[PDB]
XYZ file of C-alpha atoms in Angstrom:
225
model
C 27.716 -1.549 5.843
C 31.532 -0.805 6.207
C 30.468 2.623 5.031
C 27.647 2.936 7.332
C 29.891 4.778 9.613
C 30.847 7.520 7.170
C 27.429 8.893 7.163
C 26.708 8.839 11.025
C 26.703 12.738 10.897
C 26.734 16.025 8.677
C 28.335 15.469 5.215
C 29.599 18.186 2.832
C 28.377 17.557 -0.551
C 29.582 18.300 -3.976
C 28.054 18.093 -7.411
C 29.466 18.526 -10.745
C 27.550 17.882 -14.082
C 28.611 18.439 -17.520
C 25.944 18.637 -20.096
C 24.897 18.478 -23.680
C 21.265 18.564 -24.928
C 20.689 18.853 -28.600
C 24.125 20.475 -28.913
C 22.976 22.515 -25.960
C 26.106 22.415 -23.835
C 26.239 23.382 -20.161
C 27.613 23.096 -16.645
C 26.295 22.951 -13.073
C 27.944 23.065 -9.751
C 26.081 21.891 -6.670
C 26.856 21.935 -3.110
C 25.106 21.327 0.295
C 25.241 18.889 3.024
C 23.586 15.745 3.883
C 22.436 14.117 7.157
C 21.712 10.569 6.281
C 20.770 9.959 9.983
C 17.562 12.103 8.926
C 17.333 11.019 5.216
C 17.958 14.764 4.747
C 19.529 16.693 1.710
C 20.257 20.430 1.301
C 21.639 21.697 -2.084
C 22.305 24.655 -4.175
C 23.072 24.146 -7.958
C 24.470 26.897 -10.272
C 24.548 26.938 -13.940
C 28.047 28.003 -14.485
C 27.589 28.009 -18.287
C 25.077 31.015 -18.218
C 21.362 30.033 -18.214
C 20.171 26.433 -18.273
C 19.148 24.882 -21.639
C 16.512 22.804 -19.809
C 14.354 22.791 -16.963
C 15.782 22.519 -13.537
C 13.282 20.007 -12.279
C 14.417 17.620 -15.175
C 17.742 17.508 -13.474
C 16.555 16.714 -10.077
C 16.657 12.973 -10.009
C 20.292 13.221 -11.487
C 21.421 15.871 -9.083
C 22.668 10.935 -3.824
C 20.980 7.625 -2.489
C 23.726 6.931 -0.125
C 22.013 9.950 1.919
C 19.022 7.956 2.372
C 17.666 6.885 5.715
C 17.376 3.125 6.028
C 15.483 2.041 9.102
C 17.629 0.102 11.417
C 15.930 -3.155 10.418
C 16.758 -2.467 6.948
C 20.416 -1.479 7.179
C 21.292 -5.032 5.798
C 19.831 -3.614 2.495
C 21.878 -0.447 2.156
C 23.704 -0.818 -1.069
C 24.523 2.755 -1.218
C 26.565 3.159 1.924
C 27.788 -0.226 1.360
C 29.889 0.998 -1.691
C 31.785 3.856 0.262
C 34.306 5.134 0.353
C 34.936 3.425 -2.736
C 31.739 4.667 -4.267
C 29.313 3.628 -6.976
C 28.300 4.081 -10.490
C 24.955 5.438 -11.358
C 23.882 5.271 -15.113
C 20.470 6.277 -16.467
C 18.310 6.752 -19.482
C 15.397 9.100 -19.242
C 12.827 8.843 -21.878
C 10.703 11.934 -21.782
C 7.379 11.128 -23.141
C 6.613 12.199 -26.503
C 10.162 13.875 -26.457
C 13.909 13.255 -26.473
C 15.798 11.112 -24.011
C 18.628 11.837 -21.429
C 21.492 9.435 -20.826
C 23.496 9.663 -17.540
C 26.689 8.402 -15.891
C 27.741 9.361 -12.547
C 30.516 8.551 -10.063
C 29.444 8.988 -6.569
C 32.028 8.932 -3.756
C 34.253 10.269 -1.172
C 37.028 12.866 -1.615
C 38.542 13.199 1.772
C 35.346 13.918 3.782
C 33.177 15.464 0.820
C 30.610 13.311 -0.910
C 31.180 13.925 -4.524
C 28.920 13.361 -7.521
C 30.445 13.848 -10.760
C 27.892 13.559 -13.990
C 28.185 13.459 -17.667
C 24.840 14.259 -19.216
C 23.811 13.602 -22.899
C 20.247 14.269 -24.098
C 19.049 13.682 -27.528
C 16.102 14.023 -30.038
C 14.430 16.852 -28.141
C 11.983 19.157 -29.629
C 12.724 22.690 -29.954
C 8.976 23.014 -29.517
C 8.936 20.599 -26.696
C 8.158 21.136 -22.988
C 11.744 20.523 -22.372
C 13.648 22.434 -25.133
C 10.539 24.747 -24.683
C 10.717 25.124 -20.883
C 6.972 24.543 -20.131
C 7.338 22.654 -16.896
C 6.492 24.053 -13.833
C 9.148 24.858 -11.118
C 7.974 22.167 -8.652
C 8.205 18.420 -8.041
C 6.103 15.795 -6.313
C 6.678 13.129 -3.707
C 7.481 9.806 -5.052
C 8.651 6.229 -4.012
C 11.244 4.212 -6.085
C 11.444 0.483 -6.624
C 14.819 -0.806 -5.716
C 15.928 -4.157 -6.713
C 19.154 -6.114 -6.456
C 21.088 -6.770 -9.470
C 23.359 -9.757 -8.556
C 25.019 -10.785 -11.902
C 26.145 -7.069 -11.548
C 26.783 -7.151 -8.074
C 24.635 -3.945 -7.991
C 21.318 -2.444 -8.230
C 18.541 -2.144 -10.859
C 15.981 0.430 -10.731
C 12.824 1.665 -12.771
C 10.626 4.636 -12.040
C 8.181 7.235 -13.515
C 8.440 10.805 -12.919
C 5.771 13.194 -13.661
C 6.639 16.809 -14.388
C 3.798 19.262 -14.512
C 3.265 21.292 -17.503
C 2.332 24.871 -17.073
C -0.806 24.414 -19.180
C -1.840 22.127 -16.334
C -0.702 18.955 -17.928
C 1.819 16.145 -17.232
C 5.238 15.460 -18.694
C 6.445 11.771 -18.265
C 10.176 10.970 -17.690
C 10.498 7.353 -17.676
C 13.679 6.468 -15.620
C 15.552 3.287 -16.110
C 18.690 2.741 -13.992
C 21.713 0.693 -12.850
C 24.139 1.079 -10.102
C 27.501 -0.674 -9.653
C 30.178 -0.531 -7.086
C 33.315 1.236 -8.030
C 35.636 -1.101 -6.193
C 36.243 -4.962 -6.491
C 35.437 -4.529 -2.867
C 32.300 -6.122 -1.036
C 28.824 -4.590 -1.265
C 25.283 -4.834 0.363
C 22.774 -6.636 -2.246
C 19.405 -5.753 -1.017
C 16.123 -7.335 -0.856
C 13.540 -5.332 -2.779
C 12.476 -2.376 -0.928
C 12.225 1.187 -1.750
C 13.049 4.691 -1.236
C 10.508 7.126 -0.635
C 11.260 10.800 -1.672
C 9.864 14.161 -1.005
C 11.688 17.201 -2.749
C 11.269 20.907 -2.508
C 12.712 23.190 -4.998
C 13.366 26.893 -4.509
C 14.995 30.034 -5.614
C 17.824 32.171 -3.840
C 16.441 35.722 -3.311
C 19.854 36.847 -3.462
C 21.395 34.637 -5.993
C 21.217 36.365 -9.550
C 22.191 33.293 -11.389
C 20.401 30.424 -13.040
C 20.061 27.960 -10.173
C 18.264 25.539 -8.073
C 17.572 25.227 -4.356
C 16.476 21.676 -3.418
C 15.398 20.148 -0.202
C 14.751 16.416 -0.401
C 13.995 13.752 2.075
C 14.525 9.912 1.355
C 13.735 7.058 3.510
C 14.031 3.316 2.863
C 10.743 1.219 3.083
C 8.878 -2.051 2.306
C 10.724 -4.351 4.465
């Protein structure tokens, strides 16, 4: 990785998302730091447009794989850091089971010493009586492993994963993710063998914060090779 080195220590992070869900327009600013040496992420997101039209947890996967910890033996698989500083593109479609789907485009990259994640979010065909438009998911998240594969034609990566949000009534709400990554430069990247990223995330609330917002603590480690 010619970007391996950019992550060697504590990185400032910055996240900006602009959203639209069923005409339900919004904005979130996030900021924290990442210490890729420990596959560790620390962040705080604020709804700058007042309250969130959806559920925080629904935005978690959208809200930084370059911060992942690839064990040494797997370094030759780090696409993420391979893209930097240049950066990469992340696009997604999130089909919420029995509900609407989100579409996402992001540009992840460096701005000086800050790692920036800029996102455009558009969700459609959501139900006002939904779990989503209805806000019935619990404020939590479960651990999970994602199946990473190389997308050569595209000089990038292709990923597919399921996410299960809990419904307050004790049920489960599926969010089928589908995803592509492509480098932002015409620069050389690291095409990986299939492996995975194992995640763990913990959401919280800021006792002092008075605004709509999310505290998230995640851990991500490469595995499978």
